[PDB]
Design a protein around this ligand. Structure first.
Ligand SMILES: Cc1c(C#N)cccc1-c1cc(-c2cn(Cc3cccc(C(C)(C)O)n3)nn2)nc(N)n1
Ligand SMILES: CC(C)CCC[C@@H](C)[C@H]1CC[C@H]2[C@@H]3CC=C4C[C@@H](O)CC[C@]4(C)[C@H]3CC[C@]12C
Ligand SMILES: CC(C)CCC[C@@H](C)[C@H]1CC[C@H]2[C@@H]3CC=C4C[C@@H](O)CC[C@]4(C)[C@H]3CC[C@]12C
Ligand SMILES: CC(C)CCC[C@@H](C)[C@H]1CC[C@H]2[C@@H]3CC=C4C[C@@H](O)CC[C@]4(C)[C@H]3CC[C@]12C
Ligand SMILES: CCCCCCCC/C=C\CCCCCCCC(=O)OC[C@@H](O)CO
Ligand SMILES: CCCCCCCC/C=C\CCCCCCCC(=O)OC[C@H](O)CO
Ligand SMILES: CCCCCCCC/C=C\CCCCCCCC(=O)OC[C@H](O)CO
Ligand SMILES: CCCCCCCC/C=C\CCCCCCCC(=O)O
Ligand SMILES: CCCCCCCC/C=C\CCCCCCCC(=O)O
Ligand SMILES: CCCCCCCC/C=C\CCCCCCCC(=O)O
Ligand SMILES: CCCCCCCC/C=C\CCCCCCCC(=O)O
Length: 387
């Protein structure tokens, strides 16, 4: 067996590199929100809670991980705390991520009421409430769901540990049924699936709204055809009534729809009197209102929904990379736990899976920079002005 300090040295050098980049990158996220009022919306308060958790990974959870890989003699419950602290920070990120998905779902489903429902003061109260539950979830082992009542006394002796001490190792003190049933299944997988449902519902909503617009637009332009090409009064009235509801429905900028419906009322009135050619010609005045007001709403509405879709995809990539960085390690615990006949994943793979999970704390800054113009532009200023 190769001197264990050769593998540890690599693992540790890598952990530190990752802690450095987690700190830098998420500091930049915070500095960017601090400085650009275009980034000071509720959604980004959760971005900031997320970046704080990732700063805390680099400043505390990674040094803790390095520590608890040595097996050092430690009081069992102090071992548990350096083992479990990172579970808190991770739970924090899961709640931020879920909050964000719900925020954008409210934003696209009821845009009209979002600013009176989703306020900065309520966001901050939700964040605080989430941090406190994260401490309760990730430190639950401290409350007694732990292996400190059944230490490995042979192992503690072979290391000369004091009395009451254990060799301090994540899997020796944190029970694996906590890690699998409670943490993984219930505190991680259930929320990720929820977030999956929510982003589903967001994309469906957006897809339905865009079609509604495109329908309303076609109701508008086809019912005109029916008018130009009629020779009967009632044909004109019928086609106009179907433009008016499709106009009021799209209304749900004002000069544009006032004129439009008013001109439709104008033409409806003419058509009820049997003035076919006089209604057909008043209808034609609508086309002028279409080109100048309605088609510009169609397009800005389309543009806003495409931006929400693009934004929601950017945030779902954050959640997928969270899942990618953490599932291997969860999957390993599931084998450790459910297959006592299987050999334990080898050390080298544990190294790989642990460092992989920690790299998640580096990736969010890059997503913002690659996918969110306002962040990317801010990031450039901060770098230039303070190289
Ligand atoms: C925390 C967590 C979460 C969260 N949040 C989610 C899923 C799984 C885990 C998680 C984490 C760790 C772990 C172990 N170490 C210290 C360390 C470093 C290098 C090598 C070694 C040895 C002794 C070789 O095993 N041990 N750091 N994290 N171990 C396990 N099974 N699960
Ligand atoms: C604000 C931040 C920097 C505070 C950080 C405090 C951290 C590093 C402290 C608080 C609790 C501490 C632990 C409490 C108890 C023990 C048991 C002892 O046998 C070995 C050290 C160990 C495991 C400590 C390690 C350091 C520790 C984790
Ligand atoms: C989420 C994406 C990246 C997929 C990740 C799947 C990974 C974690 C899977 C693929 C193959 C798996 C390994 C296959 C075989 C063994 C041997 C067994 O004795 C312990 C589990 C162990 C060591 C598995 C650990 C988890 C593993 C490495
Ligand atoms: C959406 C997906 C990623 C959710 C997570 C899937 C998890 C729960 C699945 C993926 C593959 C599964 C493992 C496949 C094989 C074995 C070996 C068996 O002897 C014990 C169960 C165990 C260890 C399974 C446990 C559950 C498992 C780890
Ligand atoms: C030690 C571990 C972590 C450090 C915590 C960092 C906390 C981050 C606070 C930064 C901040 O509030 O900026 C965003 C606001 O401007 C939003 O409007
Ligand atoms: C700025 C904020 C900085 C954060 C602090 C950094 C690292 C904490 C990890 C340190 C844990 C070290 C414990 C060592 C120990 O207890 O070793 C004695 C043992 O009994 C065997 O001799
Ligand atoms: C979604 C993930 C849920 C997957 C649940 C996987 C459970 C694995 C299991 O039941 O393993 C039993 C063990 O083999 C006893 O011998
Ligand atoms: C995934 C994120 C990037 C991973 C880059 C390299 C991973 C870091 C350490 C893994 C291997 C460390 C030890 C190598 C084998 C030696 C040993 O196990 O004793
Ligand atoms: C500041 C950066 C700190 C980084 C990691 C601290 C590593 C702690 C080493 C544990 C002691 C090993 C032992 O006592 O046997
Ligand atoms: C800024 C905060 C600085 C934090 C101090 C850093 C970590 C110290 C490393 C702990 C190593 C313990 C020595 C173990 C021993 O002598 O048995
Ligand atoms: C913004 C910071 C939020 C502060 C949250 C503090 C709430 C902590 C909630 C439950 C913690 C449960 C674990 C208690 C550790 C006790 C240590 C011991 O057992 O010796």
């Amino acid at each position: 067996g190769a001197p264990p300090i050769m593998g540890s040295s690599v693992y540790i050098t890598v952990e530190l590199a990752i802690a450095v980049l987690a700190i830098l990158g998420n500091v930049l996220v915070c500095w960017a929100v601090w400085l650009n009022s275009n980034l000071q919306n509720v959604t980004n308060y959760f971005v900031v809670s997320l970046a704080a958790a990732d700063i805390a990974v680099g400043v505390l959870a990674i040094p803790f991980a390095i520590t608890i890989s040595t097996g050092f003699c430690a009081a069992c419950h102090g071992c548990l705390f350096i083992a479990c602290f990172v579970l808190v920070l991770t739970q924090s990120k899961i709640f931020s991520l879920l909050a964000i998905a719900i925020d954008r779902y409210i934003a696209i489903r009821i845009p009209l009421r979002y600013n009176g429902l989703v306020t900065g003061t309520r966001a901050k109260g939700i964040i605080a409430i989430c941090w406190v539950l994260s401490f309760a979830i990730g430190l639950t082992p401290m409350l007694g769901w732990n292996n400190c009542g059944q230490p490995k006394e042979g192992k503690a002796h072979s290391q000369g540990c004091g009395e009451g001490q254990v060799a301090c190792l994540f899997e020796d003190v944190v029970p694996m049924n906590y890690m699998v049933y409670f943490n993984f299944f219930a505190c991680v997988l259930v929320p990720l699936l929820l977030m999956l449902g929510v982003y589903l519902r967001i994309f469906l909503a957006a897809r339905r709204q865009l079609a509604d617009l495109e329908d309303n637009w076609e109701t508008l332009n086809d019912n005109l055809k029916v008018i130009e090409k009629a020779d009967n009064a009632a044909q004109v009235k019928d086609a106009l009534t179907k433009m008016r509801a499709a106009a009021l429905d799209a209304q749900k900028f004002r000069h544009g729809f006032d004129i439009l419906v008013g001109q439709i009322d104008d033409a409806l009135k003419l058509a009820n009197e049997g003035k076919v050619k006089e209604a057909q010609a008043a209808a034609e005045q609508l086309k002028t209102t279409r080109n100048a007001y309605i088609q510009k709403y169609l397009e800005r509405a389309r543009s806003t929904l495409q931006k929400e879709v693009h934004a929601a995809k950017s945030l779902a990539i954050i959640v997928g990379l969270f899942a990618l960085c953490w599932l291997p390690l969860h999957i390993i615990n599931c084998f450790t736990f459910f297959c006592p006949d299987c050999s334990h994943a080898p050390l080298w793979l544990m190294y790989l899976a642990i460092v992989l999970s920690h790299t998640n704390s580096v990736v969010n800054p890059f997503i913002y920079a690659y996918r969110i113009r306002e962040f990317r532009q801010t990031f450039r200023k901060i770098i230039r002005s303070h190289v």
